[model samples]
Target: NNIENIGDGAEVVKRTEDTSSDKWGVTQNIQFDFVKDKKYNKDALILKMQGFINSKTTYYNYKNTDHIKAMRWPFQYNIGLKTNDPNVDLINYLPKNKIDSVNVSQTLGYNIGGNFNSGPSNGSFNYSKTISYNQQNYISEVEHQNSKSVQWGIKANSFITSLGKMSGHDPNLFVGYKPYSQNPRDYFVPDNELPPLVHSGFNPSFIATVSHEKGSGDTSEFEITYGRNMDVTHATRRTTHYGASYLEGSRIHNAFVNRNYTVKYEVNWKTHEIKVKGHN
Candidate 1:
């Protein structure tokens, strides 16, 4: 008789005995502290003084935002040089150069660019810009348009697996096999020499069956297109322009010709007085 934790006694003595038990309790928390009186020797005092001096005079120091605030202030004077004449006078006179002010015309143009990607995940980007040109007659227009595209992918074809019932054999049994035709008669081979297998599901060699897979994608992009368009447009056909108010002889001149009396010349040219200045 196979038994455990039992005693066969004639009088059936008290069988009150612990078979298995576990302890689940917590111990008292404990902590300790080391206290010392504020005492200092010559070396200790010197070390403390060294730390204080380093904190105050160190070239590289870490502290609050005070460092950033101190750097935020402008290092140099916020003064800017000014031309003798203000810009307001120049802007008011720019439009006076427009000869065909009433007959002026413009041709607006629009263009679109995009990129497309097709594969496991599809994505694309598109953009457009509106452009116009000056219609002035004498301007020699020089324009150029360019574009480019790119594509790439990976492909696999005419491949097979490697697994069979046994060593190589005709009509070998293999995984993923399928009969050539459904017609029962077509299953029979035309030439009779090998063992005739009628109504047999024997499949092609696992190393012979073919497989195919392919992946393709597309991406289009446009970069920071920049160019200089030089046009010999007349000053009248110019759409955008700039003008300097201080002409060759406008304001007061105090430089002496040869360390002698300074001679001042008055040269304030009115808007109407200045006809065709230069190609803007």
Candidate 2:
């Protein structure tokens, strides 16, 4: 029920000659925002949903010649909602009535990397020379750079707030679905009334949560969070692939920070504003 936004974080090492660029190494990200608004909290509920890209850093993954090419940031996502009262819409939006929170989001994305080619190389062209660097080892042994990591899958965390905008009663807890890892492309074209991509038939991954609220300051309110995604596919060991594929499951967690923003204001002689922004 949202726009698709997806990308991953990764780095390329070893062969600095070909796969080298300022944008090539381990790419980290930082986000910032500024906002201004006015409102009247009669019986209003606010929901914010997001999609994101994530990855896990392992030993071998950290030591590949062209890790950036062979190692790809797979597509993944997460969703969350917030409300003043604890009466979340719960079905179309079931599991509602939660508070301030965040999760590792998921989105749709596509990339062309690795060492790959259309045909075999001649005496002059090496296999690596013919293929897209990203498709390189993928063609070489199929199992190269395989994390076959019996250890675990991508892990993430989330946090929620406390203190409801409405202090009438205790609200319901927060809840969410951990969708199965899927290829965005698979659900692209429309065959049924709606596009298959609309709903990837994969079951949610896991369930878990954390919450905190009711502070004694400007930004002291309530928060609830839930997420515990886990990948159950075979690629837990091999990230690269021979054909199209979906990612393993992802781990989800959350946390919250209080900023103490304004929530009440006056409009006119007969009217004014009494807003509820979860923790503001």
Candidate 3:
């Protein structure tokens, strides 16, 4: 069974601070913290995380709904994964062919993003004054169009997943085996370029299919992800101006986010259950 948990039974999230300021505009210092003393063996995991904005943004005239404009959040869901070593790909820790499906697997139209704008799940607390003209815009626009620029999402897209390695397969291996298409054809090489994604930046190769790896020296007991999942929000909306209210302002706006998913269960060869999966 490919059943997975969000973060894991013992998962916890945390954040850190920056002093050197080498990288700016990248403020998600979050880290995964799996609880200790919980006897973990060769716990192979399928860690999948697609960071996305769960907020709502609407640019509409309160006076007349005709001139309404709903602005999409200035972001999209980008899946990313990271680990300890440079050569050791996170795939080596993921379940072998866990993503491969011998079988195959959304169309919904409604109000589209319920509630207009509501706080997500509480991990968010970032509203920056990087733009100093919001209140004036909000108050002034209220006079003419009364346009509203509202947005908020607390725990936007904060969950661990089991379907991270979702690329590179022979449909010829799965679907094409039967011939459902107009022709039993396969696509071209996105390319043969292979390299484990980097832990420091958003390396794109983390989306490749998992393969075999027995591990070697310099292997880490734990693999982790590092990047800017926590986001910084700046809008002409009402709430903002909180960057310096507390922290020292090293771009800590996106720092309050929790490490929602921490555990990377590199499963033992013959085990993939819940508690006893890793121990026995």
Candidate 4:
């Protein structure tokens, strides 16, 4: 009985002040879309939006720094369905069928280089989104700009709610995975009830981080691609790299890639196991 979708989607924030007409330092955008004509199938998962986009990079040679340099990007959001496949009418339109969350838009927080320019003064970056079916394994942090005095060239990624509208722009709020039908409500429908779709056997994991504490050097990349995502040109069926190449689990990126990787899965209620492992 894994069914969830409670819509009323709301949460909008916008901030920017780096002069130069509005430079580029924080472009935190979160708009995932899907629902209309109904025919989505690329799988999805983000059931918990914890500090969704937390970034606090502070490095000063003033002899006063807490200590914690990071750079990570984990992945493993396994998706497979099987509920009789009446096509996935999992239930009778759980109140129409969709309720989006995690829509961080309006260009959220600017001022990246003029707030006192230089490296490490980077701050502000948080995003949150949620849904439930439990099987989580999250870890997201990207503290880059450590590549070599870039001072926040930070970049993050995520947009796969039916691949974010094929090729259109929709600000914030995203939740697409609907198609219900449980024989209709005979003793219920007052305010809509959810619970009729069941998809057991699974493993969830998603992480993003790019490190560098004053330049121990480990700021890496982030990704979780899966078919037809045109935000940054995505069309992947797989890409699970846990990097930093500085050894949190073991870095990889020396003319080859796949460092600290462990893209896992073995949920076999009907046979399926596509995993990976790496180290550098």
Candidate 5:
């Protein structure tokens, strides 16, 4: 079990954890300090969530024994903002991916460049290339023998802004992966509960920026980061409770930072913060 305090303006209001041979579950709750004063007008709060699940079972007999086990993990962060008008909805979503799907090399390098005019202005440039390897291998003895498989994927995004408007050119490419052959789906909505947008085991890298200027001659800038995540799981077991049984398996998830890069720069640097969560 894991426990820690999170959320800037709130404290842990409730916490619980449960585990059984076949299942495991945990829940958490938070109470904001501003809610006490009936004033949620201050800066909004932030909440980050992550989880993991694992299970195993086995059987044995006189002839042979069999066993099996597996694990799954998911993580995400959400933010919310304060608004006085009932007609306006203040919310924000940080585009990011923190799941294990591939093997990434060390940080390569970064580039810096920008333009400036007679008026107030700022900008930045960055780029990096990393070589990644995606492969899966497994070996078994007794009922079967040895097996191996290989697959690959690639993704990239870019953005441009001028005169208070913004636009970007984004594209993704993948080969040898099963998810690419399947249709895309949404993971955050209720009822739909489909597969993740990036597919199983492969998390995508992301980069986005937003800017605003007021008639008062003040300027503001914002930037968000999205990156890759990697998860590793292994399980082994042997039992003679009923019949003899034995099993072993391994899985690998990989995603490409392929030709993908993000950058940003600005002044006045005014920013907003907010967070909202559902039943735990």
Candidate 6:
């Protein structure tokens, strides 16, 4: 029933560019796009892409005063696709739905970021070279560590479901070559030490949950996410795990109220099928 917003069936497109920059002095974003509740035959898909810029400052001491100048120039991009099936209840497993996302990001993790003129002197000057690309990822992930100063690397993540319960939730568990505690209760990675998370950046990942039927739309659910940087050749058993309970209507608006944290919506001829979600 979300016609104008796209649930009734149609394709969506968007575009934008930044003529200025953020507080950080980073300027530039040329491409962005998204599609919502797109119905193709019996399957639906969500896709997205975007670009942006970031910069840092250079420190120089002159005439007994410390001066900081800004410089920035970098580009990033991403594209992703996810499928939705009408037969299974994604709301039971997904924190949100009808949304898919991808991110291409980079950062200058460390820069001689400070303004100070040590002790007064006749002519003591300090020139700090601006550092760029201190951090880079094939995906979204950042970590703070003092190792042998090795360059960062990229990470990958993939999930496939076939007529089964939704994945990415539960008591802790680990897959891939790296393994450890899988319990969401004990899952945590310091923000400074966050390993290469699949999707890490400034943008909040989008999600949508469906509430089925009209009765207390509540469903007890949990989600677990994991990823690793392919830079182990240097040595720092670096990996990341994340877990959280998908509360029915905590963050979402009034759509999930009155019903048990449920995910049910009217789509096409089905009175209670297909939930649509939009990113903020």
- TM-scores across all candidates? 0.12, 0.19, 0.22, 0.15, 0.21, 0.20
Worst 10 residues of 5 by lDDT: 137-146
Model 3: worst 10 consecutive residues (lDDT sum): 128-137
Local accuracy of candidate 5 as per-residue lDDT tens digits, 19-134: 11211122112211111111223222221211211111111121231222222222111111122222222132122222234332222222222110111122122322222322
lDDT of each: 0.14, 0.19, 0.21, 0.18, 0.21, 0.22
Number of the predicted model whose TM-score against the real structure is largest: 3
- Superior candidate under TM-score, 1 versus 2: 2
What local lDDT score does residue 218 receive in model 6, on the 0 to 100 scale?
Answer: 27
Model 6 lDDT at residue 219: 24
* Winning candidate number (lDDT): 6
RMSD of 5: 20.7
Backbone clashes in candidate 5 total 20
List candidate 4 segments past 4 Å from native. Answer: 8-44, 47-261, 266-280
Off by over 4 Å in 1: 1-131, 135-218, 229-280
Model 4, residue 193: C-alpha shift (Å): 51
Model 4 scores worst on lDDT over the 10 consecutive residues at 227-236
Provide the global lDDT of candidate 2 against the true structure.
Answer: 0.19
How badly does each model clash, as a count of residue pairs? Answer: 1, 51, 11, 21, 20, 24
RMSD in angstroms, candidate 2? 25.5
lDDT of 4 at 276: 20
TM match of model 6 to true structure: 0.20
**lDDT (Cα, 0-100) at 73 in candidate 5:** 23
Q: Write the per-residue lDDT of candidate 2 for residues 1-280, one digit (tens) a residue.
A: 2211221321111110011113211111111010111221121111121121122211112133221111112112222222232322211121222222222122211122221122231322121111111110011111111111011112112212132222111121111111122332221212232111112211121111111121211221212221122221112222446843322322221211111111221111111122232222
